Each structure stands twice: as structure tokens, then as C-alpha cells.
Amino acid sequence: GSDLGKKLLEAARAGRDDEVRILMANGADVNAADVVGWTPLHLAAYWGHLEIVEVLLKNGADVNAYDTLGSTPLHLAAHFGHLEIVEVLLKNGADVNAKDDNGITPLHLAANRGHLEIVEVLLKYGADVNAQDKFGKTAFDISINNGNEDLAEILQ
Amino acid sequence: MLELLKSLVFAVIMVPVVMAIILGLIYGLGEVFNIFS
Amino acid sequence: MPNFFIDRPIFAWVIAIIIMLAGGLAILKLPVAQYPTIAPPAVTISASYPGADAKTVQDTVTQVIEQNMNGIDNLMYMSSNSDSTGTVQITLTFESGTDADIAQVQVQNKLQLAMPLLPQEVQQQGVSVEKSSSSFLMVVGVINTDGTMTQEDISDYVAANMKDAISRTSGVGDVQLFGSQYAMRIWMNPNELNKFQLTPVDVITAIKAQNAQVAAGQLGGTPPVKGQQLNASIIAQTRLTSTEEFGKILLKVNQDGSRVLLRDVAKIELGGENYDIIAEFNGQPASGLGIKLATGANALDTAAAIRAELAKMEPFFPSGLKIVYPYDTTPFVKISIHEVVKTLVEAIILVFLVMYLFLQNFRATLIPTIAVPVVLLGTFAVLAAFGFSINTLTMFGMVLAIGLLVDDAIVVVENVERVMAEEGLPPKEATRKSMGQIQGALVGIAMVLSAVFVPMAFFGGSTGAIYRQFSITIVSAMALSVLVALILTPALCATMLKPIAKGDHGEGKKGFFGWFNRMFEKSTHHYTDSVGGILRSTGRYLVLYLIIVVGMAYLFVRLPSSFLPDEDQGVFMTMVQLPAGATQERTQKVLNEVTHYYLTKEKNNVESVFAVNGFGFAGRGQNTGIAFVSLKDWADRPGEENKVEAITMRATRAFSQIKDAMVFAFNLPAIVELGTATGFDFELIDQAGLGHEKLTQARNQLLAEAAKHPDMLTSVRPNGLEDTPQFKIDIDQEKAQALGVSINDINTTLGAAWGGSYVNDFIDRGRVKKVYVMSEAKYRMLPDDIGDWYVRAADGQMVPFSAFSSSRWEYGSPRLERYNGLPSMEILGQAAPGKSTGEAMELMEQLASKLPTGVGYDWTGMSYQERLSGNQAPSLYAISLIVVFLCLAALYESWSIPFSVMLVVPLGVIGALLAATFRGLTNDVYFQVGLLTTIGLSAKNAILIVEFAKDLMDKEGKGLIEATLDAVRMRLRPILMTSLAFILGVMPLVISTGAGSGAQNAVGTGVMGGMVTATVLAIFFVPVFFVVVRRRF
Amino acid sequence: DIAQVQVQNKLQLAMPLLPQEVQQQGVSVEKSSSSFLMVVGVINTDGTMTQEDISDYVAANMKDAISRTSGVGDVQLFGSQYAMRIWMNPNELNKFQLTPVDVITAIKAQNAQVAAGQLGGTPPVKGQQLNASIIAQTRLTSTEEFGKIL
Amino acid sequence: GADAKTVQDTVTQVIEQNMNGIDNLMYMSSNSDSTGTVQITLTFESGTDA
Amino acid sequence: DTAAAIRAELAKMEPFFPSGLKIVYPYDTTPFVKISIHEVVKTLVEAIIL
Amino acid sequence: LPTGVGYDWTGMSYQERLSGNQAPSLYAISLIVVFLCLAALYESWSIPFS
């Protein structure tokens, strides 16, 4: 893409906030995409950068974006143990019940990794537990396979 | 032939030159130390 | 001893002839090389798990091997690098002086006891063990310049027609190949496989079945029947030998009756077995032969023989094949060594000229020009005996020893001529007298020079080897010099020297010489008067001496250290590193851009650009590339702007204007088995449990904390690679079983399609080549091409990958690295201009001390050496000083007189330091050896002055001042002769611009400065020290 | 050294003939003496660790480093490294019509490290602007991941 | 179970290439039989450590 | 020398030990070989003095 | 013989050949030293020729 978009992608994946603010001042494409369809939000959520997620959602960052397979920043902040980033993306208009190109939801991931606070704050804002993957397994079957009992209890 | 001659001439030139330089340094330093004594 | 030879000149001539013959035989029977074995021996275990990810190999191969790398002798450290291309490189570095052969076999056996623990794919591809220290001598190129024949055809022609010959050549050890020979590539199409309800597993099985070999037996074999008259070996079906044979392979028979073949559902080609690496010589497809030199061989003759053998084979080459010879560094060796030899001859000539200017007689100048060659040939013989070679270090040591060789002969001859002119004696008794004066001083001089030059041969590491070369060659030269001066030189001074009456010292002989005599006499009188006036009050000068010492100390502390100077070897390197998720088309675009820059802007200083796409010095991938730039001969690059420093600077400034790339240009360093040798290499390790992410976090934290001290650390960078995207596939087994699909078939399909699979071997034109099976590129390019791949279920019903794949994106590392069996991340850095590496290293230790728990640090490369060789110099030089003091106390029979000789050191050290600070040099190795040389020569002069003074005060009963004055008067002439001859023999090395300018200058600058300063100051200060010491004691 | 070399050269000539169950464990050829130079010991003063945990720490973080220090010929660990111990039960196996053979095939299948190639591999097409290494399956790392097995 | 030429091409000519780069070597011979058995014999100079 | 290397390496891996893990030496033939030579040297010195 | 068909010696023959090529020098060297060493024991360049 453009020079400033690439530099902002680099900054976000490295985790430099001052450079991010600067590139934002010069009018950088906050929706700049990588070659795999990722964005600064995807990166700051993967690597757990919080201040950058705020700085981005304040300068007009698309929160319900999607890559070449349908993984929004929620799918990433969900199964990496990121609570603040999930709260932020949710308080800014994130589809808490989106889907990938394979029929996967943030609840599936938070259940696979055994996270609970993420599952809690997702259920709070309308996380449909009864959504079916492309194979026919909802978060309940995932919890039962993982052998996690408190998660299954929260899910029932 | 060419190299040997060229180096020999370079020597024939720079030998007394450096000898004069060294003897003049000795002269100057001896004068200095005569003044400092 | 000398009186045994003054009466027996022929025995001395015989010894000299013996030495000359030995040295000649050696010269004819010696290796030749740029540098000796200086880097510690290393061995690389190299492996390849094709179509794998760094984590896969790191888990399946590297951990295993590292675990079984136990019970090896003289192991110094171990590193490992695992790439996403499937390759693995484990590098074991052993102590110095370790006999790399036994270590190589040790590691090869400990590995052979681990092959059964690796998967069949690594065992099939083959694990190799190589010697990594020894770098390449030359690289041979092969291009087409004709109807385009892919680089694979060139690599095959090389491996089949230009490798056996190049390896049979003399001096050629290992011969490595860049490309790979042919291989049967089988590109399958999933659509034509779904047509006939097939899979890649069926193809693999069919090939394994119909390309194998079968043992049959014999026709009439033992135990035979009674009456049998015929025995004949049986041959069953064998391996196949073409693509057509591979086409007529029965995969199936359709219900209707038709038979399926491979020609239908699989394209078959003769192609390379690996395309990850690409080579271009000036935008032309090329292949390459890497050539290594064998222990105890001559590089020059080896390269000449290689060029001859390659000229032989031009007739037998297809139209459109020419060798072009990139990366040939033997010319630099030739030029450097020829220049050193030129220097030796010029010194031999300047000795003649100086002795003629000072003595005015041909028969006396004939003497030194007979002795120095003898000593040089004897040194060559000693090198041959001790198993050494003719290289830069040895020959520069010889150059620096020329000064002492000249000094000895000049002293002998001049003293003899002085005696003959003063006392009117004949040559024989004059020589007896001179030798009686000189022999003890010469022996003490030899032992002092030994004490000075030997202890440097006990340093530890890679610098120890350099110091060893210098020390051994110089000590051999000095010992032979003293032997000659005590054996042959008197025998010649007693026969050649023609008598001259007394009172005829030079007064008269109108002309330039009759003028130089009187000028030198005037200068001698003036210097004697100045010394006499100095000796009236000495305290005025014991303070100027402390001033000089303090200046020496200040200059020493303000002199930046170093290892060796960068030279212009005729070649340099360019490095290309794109961003994370790049391809090789983009890298080849960038490399063609670099090639155009070099062949257009620097068209006047460049001959070639060998661009290799896929290999960077740190990493292997489409993201990386290098370019060997080979320059025209120095005779065609007149100027400083046309050197490698300037070309590099220009190219770097220009390539700073390239987008989405980090393109640099650097100069091929000094010894290449080593590296940059900044004395700074660092490794962070997770000594307890932590994974890759916390370790990367700690690395970045350390880089941040290091960017806050730009006054001690600069260019702090990691050598590794940063994480990149990975395409994850979360296969599900519930659905795969509900559909009756063998997960093993799933994985085999995935791999063989996208990664490749070594199936079997075949025979082409009398050679065994492999048979790979892969997909046609069109169907591997994107994730959406995965659903295009179907598996065969148990019920005979195809199934798409889309039914169980559940793919995603992730971020993971394409290059993992470990240090001593533990995960690690490397870090490269430098000391801030104005400080030492010890301060930087201590700072980095203090920083690492503030890292999370489970993170430790360790040093590698020169840093490791710099943690051993840092505490040796002072101890060994103290040993030297004490031994010198003892030798001098013995020579003079006094514990105090030696001090008069041990204070003339700064008088040369300060000159060397001034010259180095002016020319802008560093405290490298050559400078140190030159320092020791100047010290030795100044010590010769002081020793002889003091010996003459003492012998006069004892024998002739003279006084202190009269004896001192007479001694300085008698000694001025030879001091000047030696200093002038040596300064003149060194001048070229100082004013040199071209091949070897760096080392030549680092030598000559210091040597000349020390010579001037000592020659000028000792003749004034040594009398002062002698008087003061003889008074206070 | 030469003795070890000849012995290994002769043993390599036999290893093909031994059972894989032996090649996998690992044949070793050492120059060791027959007497214990020293015996390092490791203990826990807090009483929370057992012999197994201490031995695993010793074997993972202390042994491979000491088996390389320029003079050690052999090391005998007075314990044993960790491993996934799978304690089968024949009653619960017959209840489901299974056998250890199935428990072994399932593990050899679902606990694997698969070579899956990469996107944009070589030789690629013209215009490919992407390259990424595929990941299909990895060696498991916990008892939960081993229980998940089907 | 391999013809002589088969061995000469798969084993002998494959191993006879590296050996050319050994130290203090004098000559080398090689034989490839019909029973598959193959032999290579390297002779080094006199005074060499075997 | 080997025992010195071993003890150095162990000192190089102790800081990363968890809480409680301590190293002990219930078998070491090194201290005897040190103190014996030390005693012989003490004897030599005493003999010089006598 | 035809062209492209060369010949060589191995085994005993090899050594034998070497011997024949080593002697001419062996005689020279072994003579030179005697001329020189003699000149040493008896300081003269003539009686060694005698």
C-alpha cells in the first residue's frame, strides 16, 4: 500500500506508540491492510498492545474489519488472554458474534484456550453460546472435550 | 631491469635526503640541549 | 667462537652454503596462503527436512542432535540454527589446536548414533558433517550466453563434467556445488487426479514399486548339481532412465478397461531438486563451483592448475558456456607477497648503498649483502621444519626482522673498519679485536630479543596464532643473525677487507664522498659537544624524560585498538533483506536493480555481480539475497575514490533510496573464517522454561535499554529474523473418521503436494539422481487453492480438505536459534567511538542483570576470545621485562646498569604512537610487532653504547665522562646506518596505495616513527642514564 | 580416540541388525572409566518436590550441559526424565472393544509434527506477492491435549 | 542383486569423487563385482599414519 | 580440571534454580588430592627451615 | 596403442619407478656434502676435488 500505511503496520507490530501518534498526525490510512489482510488493530490485539488500540479507535479505526479468512481483532484478542483489548473493542462496536470463513466465533476460541473472564465479558454483551461451527460443535462440546468443568457450568 | 634501475635511482636520491634530514634533526636537538644547559 | 672462524673461513662458507641450500629446498617445498589456520576449528552438522517449519525441525532434529552431542573432547561451544526452509545447521566450535579431523569424526559418530531417532525423511535426504572454518579459495562460474538453458541444466553439466576434474586437481580439497544435479520432478494436478479418483499416495506407491531394484540370484549357483556347466548371473527389472519410461507406469485400470498412466495426470520434467536458491551472473543464469584448498598446498599453483584444467575443457563444452571466475582472491595474495619480496630486495640494496656512502669501499658492502640472504633462507628452512607457510604474517615478520639482520652485520663491519682505520691494524687482528668487543653484547642482544618476542607466542585464541607466526619467524631470523655474525661475517671481514694505512679516515678524496666525510665529522663533533654539555647537569633531562613518558601514556590510552585492517581484496559484498512476507521475484527485482547500478554507475571499477537470491548471511529465504561484486585489477582502479571504502559508501548512500528493503554494502573483511571481529557478540538464553515470546520480549527490552546509552553502545541489532505470518490448519479428526479418511493420507497429501517428497532414485547417463513428487505451482499459491485438493476415503468416495481443514492465520518465527542446547536470540553491537569493548560488554552484562527471571546471557565469537586474551599481555610483558633485566645484569655484571638500557623504550614508543596518531591508525597487531621491533633495535644501540663505555672504564682505566663520549662517538655511525637503511626499506610500506596498503602502512608508520625518534633521542639520553646510574650506585 | 573410532566403525556395521526398539533408545559408546569421579546431588529444602520432579529438572537443565564439559566421559542420572506415562486399563479397554495397538496408533497419528510445505513455494508463479509456511499439526505438550485424543 | 555397472554407477563413482581431496595420498583403485560387493583401495605415501 | 569445570558450570546454572533446589556433594575425591599435595608441600617447607 | 588409452604403474612397479628417479639426485647430494664437509675438516677447496 502507501508508505505511511506500511510504516504504521510496522509500528503497531513492533509496539511504538509515539511513532503511531505521529504517523496518525500525518494522516495515515488507519485501515491499511497487510498482504494477509491484517490491520494495525489485528496486530495490536495479537501482541496485546492496549494504548495503541485506544489511539486507533480514537482516530477512526475500523473495528469489525476482517482478513482473507474472516478473523477480526476479537478472534485474536479472545484466545490470547487479552481482557482490556476485548473490553475496548466491545465498547466501540465489535460484532461479538461474527464468523470466519470456517464458521468460528470468539466464544469457540476462548473456550478452546480455557479462558473464563473473556467468556464472561463476551456473554455479557450477547455472546451466542449456541452457535455451530462448520462441523456442528458449539462452545459446550468444545468445553466438554477440553475437560473443563467450570467453563461448561458457566455455559449452562 | 626497469624495476631494479628505478628502485636503485629512488634510493640514490632519497638516501642522502633522509641522511640530511636526520643529521639536521640531530643538529637542532643538540642546539636545543646546548641552550638548555 | 669467532676466532675459530677468522682462522677457518671455509668452514664458515660451508655452513653458509648449507643454510642457503636448506632455505632453497624449503622455498621450493613450502605452502603459500593468505593466512594460516587462525579461527578455532568448527564443524557444521547440516540437515534438511523438506517442506517443514522451523519449529518442526527444531523439535524433531535439532533438540535430538544437541541432546546426543555428548562426550566430545575440547568442545568450546555449540550453536544451532533452524530455518523454515527445512534446513538445520548445528555448529560446534572446539578449542584452538584440536586436530579438526578427530573432532569431525567424533561428532559424525555421535550423530550416527542418533540417526535412528530422526524421521525417515531426514535420513533419506542425508545429514552431512563439514568443516566450516576453511572458507573458499575461488569460485568458478558457468553461464549460458546462448539459447537459454535453465541454471539447473548448468548445475547438472557442472556436477557431471566439471567436478571430478576439478577435484582430481592438485591442492584441491573439498569442492562444493551451488546448484543441484537433475531430478525427476513430477508435478501433479488435483483436477486430473479427481477425474480418475486418485491421490498422491497412489502416485508415490506406484513409483516406489516401478522404479525399485530386485535381487534375483544366479543361474546354476551353489550348491550346484552334478554335471552343471553354466553359471550366469540373473538381472531382473532395474531402475528407469528417462521421462518416457516414467510415463509408461500403470496407476490404474478403469472399469471400462482403459489403463491410466502418469503421462496423463502428472507433468514429468528433468529439473532441480531445490529452487529455493537462484544465481545470476550479470543478469545471466549461472551455476557455481566452490573450491577449498587442502592442508599443505600452494594457493597460487592450485589456482593456476584449476585455470589450466578449465581451459582444457572449453573444446568439449556446448555452444554457449564460458567460465568467468567470480570471487578469485588469489591475485591479492600474489600481489601482497610479491610486494613484500620486493621490499626485502630493496632493503638488501639499500644496505649496499648505505655502506658504500659511509665506508667508501666495495669489499665491505659485499659483506652484508651476503649475510642477510643466508639468514632469510635459514628462516625459510626453520619455517619448513616447524610446519609453517609463506603468508602475510610470516613475511611481514621477515620484513620487520630485516632491521635487526642489517643492524648486526653493519655493527660488525663498521667496528672492524673503525679499528683498521684508527689503529692501522690489518683485517685479521682488527676483526679479533672487534669480535672481542662485540660478541658478548651480541649474545645478550639475542637473548633480550628472545625475551621480547617469545612471550607473545603464548597468547590464547585466534590472536595467539598471529603472534605465534610473527614471534617464531622473527626469533628464527634473529638467532640465525647472531650465529652468522659470530661465524661468517668475521670470516669475511678478515678476508675481503683490504688494508688501509693509519691516519687515512677520509680526509681528502675530493668529491661527494670527501664532502660527506667532513660533514659527518662536523656533525659528530657537534653531537659530542652537545652530549658533553648535557652531562654537566642531568636533572634538566630526567624531567623531560618523564614528560615524554607521560605523553607516551596519554597517546597509548587515546589510541583506538583494533584487530586487523580492512583491505581491498578486489571483491566486496552487498546484502539485500526485504520485509517479512516477501517472495523471490521481488528480491530478484531488487538484485537486478543493484546489478544495474553496479554495471552502469561503477562501470569503470567493476567486472561482475554474482547475485544469489535465497541466501543471506543471516537467514535463508526468498526474503534475502547477496551479491558478490568483483572489481577490476588495481592497475585499472587508480585513485582512492576507486577503492572499496569509497565504492561501498557510494553504493550504500545510493541504495538508501530503495523502498521496502534494507540494502547494504560491506567490504570483504580480513580473515574470513572469522567475521567482522568487533569483539561484540551477545546471546540471550532462556535458561529455565520460557518460550519464544517472553524471550523476544526480553530481547526487545534489552534493545530499548541499550538505545539509552548511545555513548557506549551503537548499532545494537539482532542478527536473527522477526516473526512472520503462518497458515495454520486445525484439522479435525471426528469428521475425518465419520467420513472414513486416514489422517496419515491427509498429511501425506498435504505434504507431497505443497512441500515435496523424496520418493526413490533413478539412473540417468550413469549417475544416480532422485525422484521428487510435487504440485504444479498454480495450485499451491494461495489458501483458496487448498479446497482444490481431495483425499480418497475408505468407501472410495473423494473428500475435500474444506470438510475438516478449519484454517487460520498466525505469527511464528522462520528462523529459530539455540546456544548450547537452549533457545537463544543473538545480538550484534559495537562500542561507541571513543571507548573499549570491555566497557560495552560490562554495560551489557549490567543490563542483562535487569532482565526477567529465566533469562541469561553468554558471549560468542571474538567476544569469547576477548574474555580470555584480555588478561595475558601485562603478565607476559612483565615476564619479558624481568628476563631482559636479568640477561642485562648478566651481560654487564651489575644489577643497576641494565636500567640505562631499560629506559630507551618510550623514546621509540612515543615516535610510533605519534606516527600512528598522525596517519590515523589503530593499535592493531602489526603496530604492536613494529613497536617490539623498534624497542629491540633501540636496545641493541643502548646495549652497545653501554658495553663500549664499561669496557673503556675497566680495561683502559678511563673515566666515566671520557668513556661515555668516546663510546657515543664510536657508535654514532652504525646507529645512523641501521636507522637509515631500515627507514628506507620501510618507506614504500608507508607511502603505499593499492594491494595491501592497510597492513603495509600499519607496519611502516610505526616502524619509521620509532626509528626516527629512537635514533635521534637515544644518542642523547642513554649517556645521561648511564652517568646517573653509575653515580647513584 | 582411535579406539572409540574403530569401535564405532564396527558397531555401525551391526546397528542395522539390532531391533528398532533398541536403536530408538540409543546406543552409546563411551571412553568412561569405571569409577565415579564425583556425585552431584540435588535436593529441595521446602519439601514440596518429589524425586521425579527433581530428577526431571536435573536431566533437562543440568545434565546435557555437564555431559559436554571437556573431560566427562559418562553421566549416570540417579532418577529419570519426565515422560507421558499412559496407564492403560484392560477392563475399560474391553468395555470399548479396544487394544493397546489402537492406543498406540492413535498417538502415533494425533501426536505428530507434520511437514506441510508453504504458500508461494518454489518454483512459484509470476505475480505471487505472498509466502507463508503452512502448519498442520504439532507435537502435543500437555496431559489435557493427550486426553483430547480420539 | 545388482550388475557390476549398476554398482559402478551407484556406489563406486559416487564415493571415488570425495577421496580425491585427501592428504598424503598416492593412488587409488576400485573394483565392482556382480554380487554387488564393491571395494575401494586407497594407498597413501610412506610415512603416513594409517 | 574436570571437577573445576563441572563446579563452574553448576555455578553458571544455579541462579536460575527454583526455590529450594540446592546442590550438594556427597562424593568428591578432589579435596583429598588437593590437601595431600598441600601437606607434602608444607613438609618441604618445614624441611627447608630445618 | 589407440589414442585415449593411457598406462600407469602401481604396486611394486610404482616404487621401482620412484627408485630409478630418486637415485640421480641421491648421488649428487651425497657427493656435495662430502666435498663440503671435507673442505671443513681440511680448510681447502682443492684436496676435496682431489
Tab-separated table of N, CA and C in Angstrom, chain C residues 572-575 594 597-598 601-602 606 629 641 643-658 663-666:
chain	number	residue	atom	x	y	z
C	572	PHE	N	33.885	-7.289	-2.891
C	572	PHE	CA	33.123	-6.886	-1.717
C	572	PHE	C	31.712	-7.444	-1.848
C	573	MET	N	30.906	-7.248	-0.807
C	573	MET	CA	29.612	-7.900	-0.711
C	573	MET	C	28.506	-6.863	-0.611
C	574	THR	N	27.351	-7.211	-1.167
C	574	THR	CA	26.127	-6.447	-0.997
C	574	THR	C	25.062	-7.367	-0.421
C	575	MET	N	24.255	-6.831	0.490
C	575	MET	CA	23.292	-7.608	1.256
C	575	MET	C	21.912	-6.995	1.088
C	594	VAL	N	20.338	-3.611	-8.222
C	594	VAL	CA	21.706	-3.475	-7.728
C	594	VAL	C	22.709	-3.751	-8.843
C	597	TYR	N	22.870	-0.821	-11.158
C	597	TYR	CA	23.639	0.248	-10.532
C	597	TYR	C	25.133	-0.004	-10.673
C	598	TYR	N	25.567	-1.227	-10.374
C	598	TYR	CA	26.999	-1.507	-10.366
C	598	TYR	C	27.577	-1.513	-11.775
C	601	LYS	N	26.761	2.715	-13.092
C	601	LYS	CA	27.429	3.814	-12.407
C	601	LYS	C	28.901	3.501	-12.169
C	602	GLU	N	29.192	2.321	-11.624
C	602	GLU	CA	30.557	1.884	-11.341
C	602	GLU	C	31.113	1.028	-12.470
C	606	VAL	N	34.198	-2.137	-11.918
C	606	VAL	CA	33.504	-3.383	-11.622
C	606	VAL	C	33.566	-4.294	-12.838
C	629	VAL	N	30.484	-8.643	-5.576
C	629	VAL	CA	30.942	-7.694	-6.579
C	629	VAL	C	32.450	-7.830	-6.691
C	641	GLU	N	39.297	7.264	-4.548
C	641	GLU	CA	37.854	7.211	-4.739
C	641	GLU	C	37.413	5.930	-5.434
C	643	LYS	N	38.469	2.916	-4.648
C	643	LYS	CA	38.754	1.809	-3.755
C	643	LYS	C	37.448	1.247	-3.199
C	644	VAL	N	37.572	0.287	-2.285
C	644	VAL	CA	36.394	-0.419	-1.796
C	644	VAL	C	35.669	0.401	-0.739
C	645	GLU	N	36.410	1.131	0.094
C	645	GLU	CA	35.775	2.034	1.048
C	645	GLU	C	34.823	2.991	0.340
C	646	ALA	N	35.320	3.674	-0.693
C	646	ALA	CA	34.523	4.696	-1.361
C	646	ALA	C	33.383	4.082	-2.160
C	647	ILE	N	33.654	2.996	-2.884
C	647	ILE	CA	32.596	2.324	-3.631
C	647	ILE	C	31.489	1.877	-2.687
C	648	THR	N	31.868	1.298	-1.549
C	648	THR	CA	30.886	0.874	-0.559
C	648	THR	C	30.060	2.052	-0.063
C	649	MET	N	30.723	3.154	0.295
C	649	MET	CA	29.990	4.318	0.783
C	649	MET	C	29.003	4.824	-0.263
C	650	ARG	N	29.460	4.965	-1.508
C	650	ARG	CA	28.591	5.438	-2.579
C	650	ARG	C	27.401	4.509	-2.771
C	651	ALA	N	27.660	3.202	-2.844
C	651	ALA	CA	26.587	2.247	-3.084
C	651	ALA	C	25.579	2.251	-1.944
C	652	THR	N	26.051	2.372	-0.703
C	652	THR	CA	25.135	2.402	0.431
C	652	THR	C	24.280	3.661	0.401
C	653	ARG	N	24.904	4.814	0.149
C	653	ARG	CA	24.133	6.046	0.034
C	653	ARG	C	23.100	5.954	-1.079
C	654	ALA	N	23.447	5.310	-2.194
C	654	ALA	CA	22.512	5.209	-3.306
C	654	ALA	C	21.363	4.263	-2.984
C	655	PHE	N	21.669	3.099	-2.415
C	655	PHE	CA	20.648	2.117	-2.083
C	655	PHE	C	19.814	2.519	-0.878
C	656	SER	N	20.226	3.546	-0.132
C	656	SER	CA	19.330	4.115	0.866
C	656	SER	C	18.055	4.650	0.232
C	657	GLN	N	18.061	4.876	-1.080
C	657	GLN	CA	16.908	5.384	-1.808
C	657	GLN	C	16.090	4.275	-2.457
C	658	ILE	N	16.089	3.081	-1.877
C	658	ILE	CA	15.269	1.976	-2.357
C	658	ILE	C	14.202	1.692	-1.311
C	663	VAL	N	19.016	-2.524	2.051
C	663	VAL	CA	20.133	-2.921	1.204
C	663	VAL	C	21.389	-2.236	1.715
C	664	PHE	N	22.401	-3.032	2.039
C	664	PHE	CA	23.680	-2.520	2.499
C	664	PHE	C	24.792	-3.055	1.613
C	665	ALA	N	25.950	-2.416	1.709
C	665	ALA	CA	27.159	-2.867	1.040
C	665	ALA	C	28.293	-2.834	2.047
C	666	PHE	N	29.040	-3.928	2.142
C	666	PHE	CA	30.153	-4.004	3.070
C	666	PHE	C	31.372	-4.590	2.375
